[PDB]
Amino acid sequence: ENSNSASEGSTINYTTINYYKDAYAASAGRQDAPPLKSPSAEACVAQLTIGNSTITTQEAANIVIAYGEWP
Amino acid sequence: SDKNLIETRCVLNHHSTQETAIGNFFSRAGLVSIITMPTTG
């Protein structure tokens, strides 16, 4: 079988059925802070310095990390 | 404190502080009196 399914390369494993040499021809099958709730820097006078500039906040639990992922 | 508000590099600073020791600041002769003994006046 050619490993050309759209889900190939994901962490989730699906149990599907197939009768053809191409994996994408297979059935959908079945599978077998929170990133969306605006995770605070802590969940994942203050001063954030970057380059030659500094802003002043207050708490790290007041900084949202979009989708829980740092650049 | 530079390396607190800005991003800094490492500088191996060996600039001396000796010339500002009070001894060097003061041990230089200075005028403190002008005395005159004229013949006339």
Description:
Chain A: It is found in: Host cytoplasmic vesicle membrane; Host nucleus; Virion. Chain A: Interacts with protein 3CD. This is part of a larger assembly, with chains A (71 residues) and B (41 residues). Chain A is mostly beta strands and 71 residues long. Chain A contains no helices and four strands. In chain A, the strands form two sheets. A two-stranded antiparallel sheet of chain A has the order 1-2. Chain A starts with 13 loop residues before the first strand and ends in a 14-residue tail after the last strand. Chain B has 41 residues and is mostly helical. Helices cover 22% and strands 0% of the residues of chain B. Chain B contains two helices and no strands. At the A-B interface, β3 of A face loops of B.
The string of secondary-structure elements of chain B, in order, is HH
| Main sheet strand line-up of chain A | 1-2
Q: Ends of chain B: how far apart?
A: 65 Å
The radius of gyration computed from the alpha-carbon positions of chain A, rounded to a whole number of angstroms, is 22 Å
Overall geometry of chain A comes to elongated
Topology, element by element:
The structure is cut from a larger assembly and holds chains A (71 residues) and B (41 residues).
Chain A: E1 14-15, E2 30-31, E3 46-50, E4 53-57
Chain B: H1 2-5, H2 22-26
